[model samples]
Target: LGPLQIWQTDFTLEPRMAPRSWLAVTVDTASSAIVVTQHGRVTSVAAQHHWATAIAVLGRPKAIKTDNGSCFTSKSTREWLARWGIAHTTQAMVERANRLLKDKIRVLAEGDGFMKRIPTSKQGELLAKAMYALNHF
Candidate 1:
């Protein structure tokens, strides 16, 4: 229950030229600042960049909560979090950031829920761009 102590992740989407892209965004619990993000064709890579970006931008955390995605549950990600002595938690919380975003995504997508249907790879790209935008504007 402190600044940046609680982190949550989720994906969002928008239209693109080649293929629809997705976004993997992490927000600080207290400041609501974007920790990190990336764009790519894989969640693993997106999570990897998010992890690295978090280190550079927000440092380690007491714990990180995320969905039961392959990126979060992967053995490699497990090891990475272990290396930092960071605890990882995966569960649903009523006030969880991603959960709320998940709900609103329907509205953002005009009731189509395009966010859930977007490819993870493309999401990563948009997520990275969003993080940069969050940092400056």
Candidate 2:
């Protein structure tokens, strides 16, 4: 059994002109490193990619948890978890984390009335900003 528990989270972003996208966030149990994040079309595929990337970075943990989002509950995610022998836990164990995510997103988008498409030049900057915010202060 692992010493610490790692939790992942699921959230949605409603962008202009396009359909909503899913946000799968993976965080370490001991530190603030956000190993991997998958933002794309809201589907099980995104969850699977996020789960795989997170595992590659953080390795397997004693337990993995997420909210009741359909993406998290999809067969693809379950299959991947089963393959790795990871114990799947519900997000109830870490409700505060999800709340924090919502708050951060709200804070980040506070200016410019929030745009569906951030300027292409700033896409990388936005991602870096998000990653740094998630990883550390």
Candidate 3:
């Protein structure tokens, strides 16, 4: 239950139809709530900035789990995590969350309820809805 082990963040490539788009998502490990959803491949220093801005609002996580991507491994990212006093875990848990998020987005984009090929221009809006739906209902 400690703050250091209760949250995770990662980026997954956007749904099949949307190329060059990435979803930067953060999850509350305890409640399984999706806390942040940003659009962009935004890795490296950019990813660090993305999360830093989020921490200002969402508050620092106990720790964020991410892959060995440059975004998470860069010296600046290491310093950022340390400066925030957050620990970092490896891939297992966050990977599952990533899969679940991707699946949910897929369902939203293709499900009969409101499923349709999302236009590039509206992908962000639709993605927000999908994230909200997954996090809430």
What is each predicted model's overall lDDT from 0 to 1? Answer: 0.58, 0.60, 0.68
Over 1-137, each residue of candidate 1 has an lDDT whose tens digit, in order, gives 45557766655543331253444567766567665333544466567676777767876777788878787889988888888888888833323444444444334344334544545454444444444545456
Error of 2 at 104 (Å): 5.1
Model 1 worst lDDT run, 10 consecutive residues: 13-22
Give each model a TM-score.
Answer: 0.60, 0.67, 0.73
Per-residue lDDT of 1-137 in model 3, one digit per residue for the tens? Answer: 34344667778776543564666767777666664455546667666766776576467777777777787888888888888898976555566767777787677767634364566766666666766776675
Report lDDT (Cα) of residue 51, candidate 3: 78
lDDT of 2 by residue, 73-126 (tens): 888878878888888866432344445554555456555356444443444445
Pick by lDDT: 1 or 2, better one: 2
TM-score of 1: 0.60
Ranking by lDDT: 3, 2, 1
Model 2 misplaced regions, further than 4 Å: 1-3, 14-21, 92-116
Q: Looking at model 3, report the run of 10 residues with the lowest lDDT sum.
A: 1-10
Q: Of the candidates shown, which would achieve the greatest TM-score relative to the real structure? A: 3
lDDT of prediction 3: 0.68
lDDT of residue 24 for candidate 1: 57
